[PDB]
Structure 1
Amino acid sequence: KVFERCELARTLKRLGMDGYRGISLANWMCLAKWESGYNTRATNYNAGDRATDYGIFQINSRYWCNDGKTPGAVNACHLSCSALLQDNIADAVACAKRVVRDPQGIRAWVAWRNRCQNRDVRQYVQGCGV
């Protein structure tokens, strides 16, 4: 499913993402935007290392979910990567919360550093009523 901006904002808010581990809703919106464009079925295989990024948050199959074909994969979220491809993002959000519970936090995603860090990310939640 490809979420409309405000629809996603309200959904994430309801799932307890706003201010989770100090991460504001607008940063999460900036992350999903640049990682997948609010698309839940987005997948990206990295031929150089054999791991694939799944879903709206492009969560990695090496550390977070298990797809069975990634070498030395730890399944920290204890989920099948398939779960991060559903239209219902409840599992993707619970896994994303797991990821940021690590010391790096939201910095775990390079795209966040490139396009969200130190920027005016207000635009991502404007007019959504969250």
Structure 2
Amino acid sequence: KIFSKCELARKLKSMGMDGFHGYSLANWVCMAEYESNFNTQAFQGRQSQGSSDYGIFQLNSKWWCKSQSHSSANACNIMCSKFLDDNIDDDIACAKRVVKDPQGMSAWVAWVKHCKGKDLSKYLASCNL
């Protein structure tokens, strides 16, 4: 499933993301756009050792969820496979956990290179929330 900007913006407001750990809804949505183009099935196999990135938040297995051959630290306490799913609920709860670390939202690269430096005050403007 691919979400639209506003669709997602609505979803996240719903699940308590507006201002969650100092980050505005704009922020979260932008991370998403830049990380997966809003694709719940987005996946990226990293050529490192056993870390791949999952779902709309491109959630890494080295840290965050379990893989297969590839064991994890499993911060989020979930099977990484749970993220390649149409339902964004655990994807989000994992996302809220990621944010807690020192790096916060910079855990997410696309976010850093595409959104951190941007003025996102108009980002959501077209959205009925």
Whether TM exceeds 0.5 here: the answer is yes
More strand, by proportion:
1
* Percent identity between the two aligned chains: 51
Please list the CA deviations of residues 73-110 of structure 1 after superposition, one character each: whole Å capped at 9, or x if unmatched: 20000000111111110100000000011121111112
Q: Secondary structure at the match of 2:45?
A: strand
Q: Which has the higher contact order (CA 8 A, sep 6+)?
A: 1
- When normalised by structure 1's length, the TM-score is 0.93
- How many residue pairs were aligned? 129
Q: Which amino acid aligns with 2:24?
A: S
The runs of at least 4 consecutive aligned structure 1 residues that moved more than 3 Å come to none
Quick check: 1:5–1:124 contact (8 Å CA) kept in 2?
A: no
1:5 paired with 2:5, answer: yes
Residue in structure 1 matched with residue 119 of structure 2 by the alignment: 120
Q: Secondary structure at the match of 2:44?
A: strand
The offset of 1:4, in angstroms, is 1.1
Q: For 1:63 and 1:48, how far apart are their aligned partners in 2?
A: 13
Q: Which amino acid aligns with 2:116?
A: Q
> What's the RMSD between the two structures over aligned residues?
1.2
Contiguous gaps of at least 5 residues in structure 1: none
Residue in structure 1 matched with residue 73 of structure 2 by the alignment: 74
Residue in structure 2 matched with residue 83 of structure 1 by the alignment: 82
Contiguous gaps of at least 5 residues in structure 2: none
